Symmetry: C3
Subunit: 346 residues, 3 copies
C-alpha cells in the first residue's frame, strides 16, 4: 500500500560508492544519494519477498558506540545479519577515544581486524580521523554535527508515502530546535535533493549560519529551497510532511526547563498545526524517541509541572493516521543496509 | 543414562503454538506444556547426535535484559545459534523502559526489525504490553511474578531423572521463600501438569493467596495436588525431588539478615532433610546460583557471622550424588530452544 | 614483503593439542609453541588468499571479560567468526566471579552450554580452576601473572620481520616494568624457544625471582639466554627487536607519578636507545596501547607536568619505519585463531 517503485548508470554509482566512507551527506552528490535511497528500496523488497541476496557474506563489522543508542545499533545489526556479516558491538567504556589512546591508533588496529566500522559518538572531527586512518569503510552512526543515516531513512519514507512525487517535488517543515545533527542533515539532505525545506522555530536555534549559507549555495544549484522562520502559520503552509524531535534535555536544568518549555512550546506539532498546512494528506515524522504523552515517568512529571501531555508532539498526532513514525523507524535498517552493501558489498 | 524417551496430534500443537508469545505458564494447556517439554527432549537428542536441523535459519532475535542475567542470556544465545538465528543483546542501560519511552513505542520498533523478542525484567505488565504490541513472538525470560522457561527446564530434568514416571506421577517439595517468580511458576506448572507439589516454608512467604486459589482450581481439574505447610517433616515426606533457592537479598539489610536467616534457617535443605523424605533416590534441584558453601566472599562472611557454611543448601547436599542442579542448568537451553522453535520455527 | 614461510609430525601436534586449555606458555613444549606459531601463519595466508577453511563451524564460544579489553575481545571475535563459530560476550558485571558464586559452579554451567571458553581477568588461580572444571578448552586472554596469546602474536611478528632467522637465533630486549604478565610471558616464551632475552629496567621491577629461576632452568636446556640488567647501553646492544609497554598506572597516584616517571624515564625507548643497539634494522614492538605522544588528554597532561611528549616511547620512534606495532597488533587475531583451531578444531 505504501512503497517506492523505481542501465549503465546503475553500476556507474556502484563504482563511485565502492570503498567510500559515509560520514556526512555533504560528501555525496544528489545522484549518489538517490542511488542509496533506491538501493534501500530494493533491499527492502527483497527481504519481504524472502529473496534477499547476501552481499556481505564473510565480512566482520565493528560497531563503535561511545554513547549508547539501541535504535541505531539494532538497525546496523539486523542489516549486517541479513547480509551475512558478523558483528562486534563495542559500547560505552570507562574511557572515551582520545582520553588515553588516539583515534589514529584505534583506527589503525580495528582496520586490520574488521572489514567495515561504524562510529556513533562525539565530534565529526573524530569520525573524520577514523575515516582517514581505518583503511576500510567507516560509517557515521551519529556525531554532534551530523546524522546522515537517519535522513536516508526519512527521505525513503517520504518517497514511500507520496503518490508518485520525486524528492525534488516535496515540501516539508521541521519544527523545533534545528541547531543539531538532525536539523543539519535534514537541511543538507533537502538541499542536495532539490527539496523545499523550512526550519520552523526560534531564530537562536536555527542551524549554524555557515552551514545554512553552504546549503543555500547547493539549493540554488539543485533547484531546491531553504527558508528559516519563527512563524509557524507561514512555515507549515502547504507542506507534505511535518517533522520534529525532542527539544528538552534530560539533566540540565530545573528552571532551564521552565525556560526551554516556554520558548519551544509554540512549536509543538499538534492537530491545530497540521490543520494550518491546509493539506489533509499531511504526514507527521519524528526520528524518535518522542515525548508524546502522559505515560512515561518523565511524561507524568512534565504533566504535573507544565500541565502538558506531550512536549514536541501531542499523543493525538503521534497515534493519528497521519503518523508514519514507525515506517520511518523501520527504514533506518533498510537504508543502513544500503550504505553498507554499496560501500563494502561484494 | 538419564533421559526422556517419548501422529496428527504432534502437528496439532505445532499449529496452536505457532506465533504465540511465552509470557507465563498460565497461558498454556497441560498438553501444550507437555509438547514443549517433549520437543526439548528431541532438540537435545538431535544436538548430541550432531543431527540438529535448523528451524530458525535467517531469523534475528532481540534479547532485552533490563536486569542482567548471564545464565538466561547464554541459554537463549546458544539456543538461537544452534538453530541458525542471529542475536542482538540489549543489556541494562541508563534508563529503563518507561522512564522516558514507553513499551508501546519500544515494542513497535523492535517488532519491525526483529523476528522474535526476549524480555527479562520487571513487572509482568511490562512483558504483557510488549507481547500485545510487538507483533512477533515475545518470550518472558523472567518478570517479578513469573519465570516460565526455568520450570520447563525443571520438569524436563524431573522426567529425565525418573524411571518411567509421568509428571502426573511425581511428588516434590520446594523449601524456602516461595513468594516469587520461581515459586509461582513451579506451582502453576505443578498444577497444570497434575503433579503433587508442596511449598514448605513460613506462611508469610507462601505464594500470593489469589494465585494459590487459581492454581488449586486448576489442580482439581488435572488431578494434581497443592499443599502449603510450615512443617518440613510433613512436607518433604515421600518426595521424589527437593527444590530450593537463595532466600536472602544482596543489599538490604544488616540486621534484616539476622532476622531473615533466623526465619528461613529451619528450611535449609541438608542431608537431614533428604533423609526425612524416606526416599534414598531423592534428588535435589536448585535454579542457581546457590549459596551452598564457605568459599565465596559472601560465603566466608556468612560463615563468620552466623557460623553457617551454606544457607539454603549445604555443600554436602549440593555436591552429593542426589544433586542434579547442573543437568537442570543445561536444560534451560534445550527448553528455551523448544519455546523458540515451536513459536517461531519455520 | 614481510611474512613467515615454513609430515607425520604436523599431525602429531594436532593430537597433542586437541582438547587442551591454553592457560600459560609454561604448559607447552617448544615444538608445541612453534606449531601454534606455524599454524597462525597458515591461517593468516588462507584468510588473505580468500581460501580459509572453517574448522569451528557450529561451535559456540563464551568470552568472559571480568575486566574489559576491546583489543583482545575483537581478536577472539574476528577469529571465531572467520572460522564459523558464534560468540557470546560476557563483559564486566556488578559482581566478579567468586564474590557471590564460585568458578567451580560457573565453569560447570558454561561447560554444558559452550564448546570453548575464554577468560580475561584476575589471578591465574581463577583460570586454572575454570580450566579444571569447565570440561571444554579454556583459553587465558590475560591474568595478573600471564598473557600467553600476546606472546604468540609477538613471536610470529618477529619471525615475519626477520630474513630467515629462527626464534632460536633472535635477540631482543624488553625495556621498562617487566614484573607483570607481559614481562613474564615474554621471558617464558623466550626461554621455551631458545631466544636471547634481556629485561632492561629497575631491579625492583624485574620479574618474580622464582619465575626467573624457573625460566633459566628452561633456557639452559633450549640453548636460550636470559639476562636481567639496569644498564640500557649493555642491554639493548645488538638486539633485533626492542619492546616496551606503559609503566604508569591510571589512578594511583599524583606524586607516585612524579616518583614513577623519575624511576622509569631512563628506560623510555627513544631514537637514542635504538641507535645504542648498533643495528640499523632494529624494530620496535609494543603490546599497546602506548602513551607515545602529546595528543591524548593524559598526553597533554603528562606534557604540561613533566615536560615529556610520550612516556615509554617517543612519537618519533612509534611512527618510525622501525615500528611494527600494528603488524604485531593484527597478529593477535591470527595467533588466537591458531590456539582455538588447534585445541577445538574439528
Amino acid at each position: 500500500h505504501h512503497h517506492h517503485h523505481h542501465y549503465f548508470q546503475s553500476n556507474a554509482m556502484a563504482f563511485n560508492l565502492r570503498n567510500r566512507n559515509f560520514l556526512k551527506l555533504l560528501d555525496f552528490s544528489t545522484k549518489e544519494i538517490q542511488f542509496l535511497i533506491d538501493l534501500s528500496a530494493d533491499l527492502k523488497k527483497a527481504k519481504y519477498a524472502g529473496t534477499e541476496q547476501k552481499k556481505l557474506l564473510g565480512k566482520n563489522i565493528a560497531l563503535i558506540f561511545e554513547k549508547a543508542s539501541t535504535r541505531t545499533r539494532c538497525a546496523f545489526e539486523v542489516a549486517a545479519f541479513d547480509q551475512g556479516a558478523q558483528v562486534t558491538y563495542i559500547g560505552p567504556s570507562g574511557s572515551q577515544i582520545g582520553d588515553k589512546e588516539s583515534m589514529k591508533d584505534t583506527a589503525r588496529v580495528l582496520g586490520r581486524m574488521y572489514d567495515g566500522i561504524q562510529y556513533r559518538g562525539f565530534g565529526q572531527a573524530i569520525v573524520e580521523e577514523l575515516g582517514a586512518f581505518a583503511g576500510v569503510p567507516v560509517w557515521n552512526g551519529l556525531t554532534d554535527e551530523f546524522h546522515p543515516t537517519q535522513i536516508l531513512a526519512d527521505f525513503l519514507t517520504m518517497l514511500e508515502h507520496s503518490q508518485g512525487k520525486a524528492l525534488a517535488d516535496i515540501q516539508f517543515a521541521y519544527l523545533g530546535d534545528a541547531r543539531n545533527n538532525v536539523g543539519n542533515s535534514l537541511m543538507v539532505g533537502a538541499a542536495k535533493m532539490g527539496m523545499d525545506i523550512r526550519l520552523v522555530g526560534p531564530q537562536a536555534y536555527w542551524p549554524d549560519e555557515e552551514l545554512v549559507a553552504a546549503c543555500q549555495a547547493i539549493a540554488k544549484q539543485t533547484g531546491g529551497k531553504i527558508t528559516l522562520t519563527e512563524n509557524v502559520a507561514e512555515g507549515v503552509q502547504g507542506c507534505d510532511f511535518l517533522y520534529t524531535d525532542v527539544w528538552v534535555s534530560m539533566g540540565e536544568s530545573p528552571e532551564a526547563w521552565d525556560e526551554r518549555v516556554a520558548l519551544m512550546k509554540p512549536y509543538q506539532v499538534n492537530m491545530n498545526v497540521l490543520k494550518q498546512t491546509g493539506n489533509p494528506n499531511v504526514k507527521f515524522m519524528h526520528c524518535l524517541p518522542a515525548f508524546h504523552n502522559d505515560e512515561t515517568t518523565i511524561g507524568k512529571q512534565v504533566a504535573d509541572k507544565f500541565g502538558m501531555k506531550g512536549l514536541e508532539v501531542t499523543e493525538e498526532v503521534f497515534e493519528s493516521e497521519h503518523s508514519i513514525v514507525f515506517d520511518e523507524a523501520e527504514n533506518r535498517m533498510h537504508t543502513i543496509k544500503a550504505v553498507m552493501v554499496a560501500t563494502l558489498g561484494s
